[PDB]
Amino acid sequence: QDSLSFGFPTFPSDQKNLIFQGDAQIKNNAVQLTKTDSNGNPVASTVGRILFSAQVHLWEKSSSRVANFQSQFSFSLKSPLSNGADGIAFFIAPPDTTIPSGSGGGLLGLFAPGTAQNTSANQVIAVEFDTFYAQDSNTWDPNYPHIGIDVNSIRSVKTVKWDRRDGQSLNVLVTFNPSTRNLDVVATYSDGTRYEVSYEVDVRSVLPEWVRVGFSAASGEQYQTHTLESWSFTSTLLYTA
Amino acid sequence: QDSLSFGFPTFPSDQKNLIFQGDAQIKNNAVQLTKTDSNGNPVASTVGRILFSAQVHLWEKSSSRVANFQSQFSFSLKSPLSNGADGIAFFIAPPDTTIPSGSGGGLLGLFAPGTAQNTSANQVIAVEFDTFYAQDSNTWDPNYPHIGIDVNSIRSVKTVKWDRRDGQSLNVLVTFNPSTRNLDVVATYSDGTRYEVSYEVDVRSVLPEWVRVGFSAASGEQYQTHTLESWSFTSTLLYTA
Numbered sequence: 001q002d003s004l005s006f007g008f009p010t011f012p013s014d015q016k017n018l019i020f021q022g023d024a025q026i027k028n029n030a031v032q033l034t035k036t037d038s039n040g041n042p043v044a045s046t047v048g049r050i051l052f053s054a055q056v057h058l059w060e061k062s063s064s065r066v067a068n069f070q071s072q073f074s075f076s077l078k079s080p081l082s083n084g085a086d087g088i089a090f091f092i093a094p095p096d097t098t099i100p101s102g103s104g105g106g107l108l109g110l111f112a113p114g115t116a117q118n119t120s121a122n123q124v125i126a127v128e129f130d131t132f133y134a135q136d137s138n139t140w141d142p143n144y145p146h147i148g149i150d151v152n153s154i155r156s157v158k159t160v161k162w163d164r165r166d167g168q169s170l171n172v173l174v175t176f177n178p179s180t181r182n183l184d185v186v187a188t189y190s191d192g193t194r195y196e197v198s199y200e201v202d203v204r205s206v207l208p209e210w211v212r213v214g215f216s217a218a219s220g221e222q223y224q225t226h227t228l229e230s231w232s233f234t235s236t237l238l239y240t241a
Numbered sequence: 242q243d244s245l246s247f248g249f250p251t252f253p254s255d256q257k258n259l260i261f262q263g264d265a266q267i268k269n270n271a272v273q274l275t276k277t278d279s280n281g282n283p284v285a286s287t288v289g290r291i292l293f294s295a296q297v298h299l300w301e302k303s304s305s306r307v308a309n310f311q312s313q314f315s316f317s318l319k320s321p322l323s324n325g326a327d328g329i330a331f332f333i334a335p336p337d338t339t340i341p342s343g344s345g346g347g348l349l350g351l352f353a354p355g356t357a358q359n360t361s362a363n364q365v366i367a368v369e370f371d372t373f374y375a376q377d378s379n380t381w382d383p384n385y386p387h388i389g390i391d392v393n394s395i396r397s398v399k400t401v402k403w404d405r406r407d408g409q410s411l412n413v414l415v416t417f418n419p420s421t422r423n424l425d426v427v428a429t430y431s432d433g434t435r436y437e438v439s440y441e442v443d444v445r446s447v448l449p450e451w452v453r454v455g456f457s458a459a460s461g462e463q464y465q466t467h468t469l470e471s472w473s474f475t476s477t478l479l480y481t482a
């Protein structure tokens with residue numbers, strides 16, 4: 001299809017079009033990307049991801065069209081600690097994508113250790129909400145919590161300082177305009193605190209014509225829950241001139 | 242998801258989200274539901290169907306909601322014969338639906354001979370465009386080409402007279418309003434000729450909560466091409482009170 005859109009105001013346990021990978025599962029009408037114990041407390045060493053089953057037609061070579069898309073979602077992070085880790089990310093990748101071996105912790109379940117910073121070895125665009133930046137294990141991160149745009153590497157091409165608020169929902173809007181090639185991210189807390197980061201990228205040179213979209217999250221030594229509360233997505237192939 | 246929509250202004254051969262059953266296949270940017278030879282001519286004894294891969298959430302028992310949906314599409318039928326057969330239908334059925342054994346010809350690839358008219362043995366709602374009504378074989382049909390609403394039986398709960406026009410595209414809009422439980426069908430030819438038919442049905446007593454939507458067509462002794470040219474669909478769960 002040239003256009004596709006779906007919306008999950010909440011996430012009832014009875015799902016049919018979501019691909020669950022790793023420890024991701026439904027709990028309390030929300031998607032818990034990372035594992036939690038019987039009491040709902042976050043645990044260490046856990047990775048989880050979800051992808052919508054239907055493939056998205058991001059661009060079409062024959063017609064020279066590229067899709068304009070928008071993804072709106074909200075999530076919250078909670079942890080008994082204060083150095084919750086590692087983060088959640090919205091991502092776009094080939095349809096057959098699976099959790100790379102050894103991609104836990106700071107690799108957010110998106111990259112393999114050996115090629116995490118090798119742009120020519122990956123095919124993925126992601127918007128990460130990174131809460132752990134210890135320079136001994138996350139050498140690629142700026143020294144502070146941040147939102148970043150990742151293009152084929154765990155080392156963001158662009159970032160903005162962000163504030164982690166335990167238990168508060170962050171509302172996010174990610175937009176890609178094929179006319180300007182601008183991938184825009186706007187995140188806001190209920191009180192109006194706003195964060196913005198943008199970057200110009202030609203999706204055609206990074207991803208194949210058909211892709212899948214979803215979310216990934218991980219916790220290594222440090223942990224926190226990565227709760228996806230709602231999500232809507234829409235994409236429309238448009239002629240770019 | 243509570244809401245889902247997709248649009249196929251045309252059908253390029255590079256498809257990822259359609260389930261092809263029987264002889265259905267893409268040719269010349271359109272879906273040929275029934276088999277055609279090398280020259281693109283229709284042949285006898287053929288059945289074919291397509292279904293969008295993502296499941297649609299039709300109704301939800303726990304929340305007492307029912308989907309409001311709309312399906313817009315266009316097709317054309319063509320045949321060198323005086324009596325092209327057998328017809329095409331838009332349908333809704335359980336997610337694991339497949340072509341029943343012996344459902345060719347007048348059964349449109351939707352029902353098995355043994356239970357074609359047994360409403361308690363089927364789970365399907367279809368809008369048929371029936372061009373073959375020979376009273377000796379299709380005994381259940383009115384004696385003329387017609388548009389029919391089928392609820393668990395090849396014997397339409399309602400039909401209206403319709404004219405078959407060789408090679409002309411018919412545009413159809415099928416709507417279901419959960420508030421009134423009215424399933425409306427509006428079909429038009431390019432010259433303005435219009436056909437309307439409506440029926441009240443509680444979808445909750447006929448179909449499971451999750452379903453797949455698609456098209457089906459068949460040709461028995463007589464034949465014709467059944468070409469699906471475009472299709473857009475949208476559905477949204479709504480509180481019914």
Ligand SMILES: CO[C@H]1O[C@H](CO[C@H]2O[C@H](CO)[C@@H](O)[C@H](O)[C@@H]2O)[C@@H](O)[C@H](O)[C@@H]1O
Nearest residue numbers: 085086104105106132136137219220221222
């Ligand atoms: C906690 O520091 C010790 O372990 C470090 C390994 O860090 C893991 O946990 C991080 C946060 O969950 C995660 O970002 C990283 O990928 C690892 O999974 C190590 O680097 C320190 O030197 C120290 O031993």
Ligand SMILES: CO[C@H]1O[C@H](CO[C@H]2O[C@H](CO)[C@@H](O)[C@H](O)[C@@H]2O)[C@@H](O)[C@H](O)[C@@H]1O
Nearest residue numbers: 326327346347348373377378460461462463
């Ligand atoms: C060709 O006529 C002979 O067979 C007929 C069987 O009818 C088949 O074809 C019809 C039109 O394609 C279709 O509606 C039906 O389901 C069968 O597939 C029969 O009716 C005639 O009396 C004759 O024997």
Ligand SMILES: [Ca+2]
Nearest residue numbers: 106130132138
């Ligand atoms: Ca990090």
Ligand SMILES: [Ca+2]
Nearest residue numbers: 347371373379
């Ligand atoms: Ca018939």
Ligand SMILES: [Mn+2]
Nearest residue numbers: 130141148156
């Ligand atoms: Mn980072």
Ligand SMILES: [Mn+2]
Nearest residue numbers: 371382389397
């Ligand atoms: Mn009929």
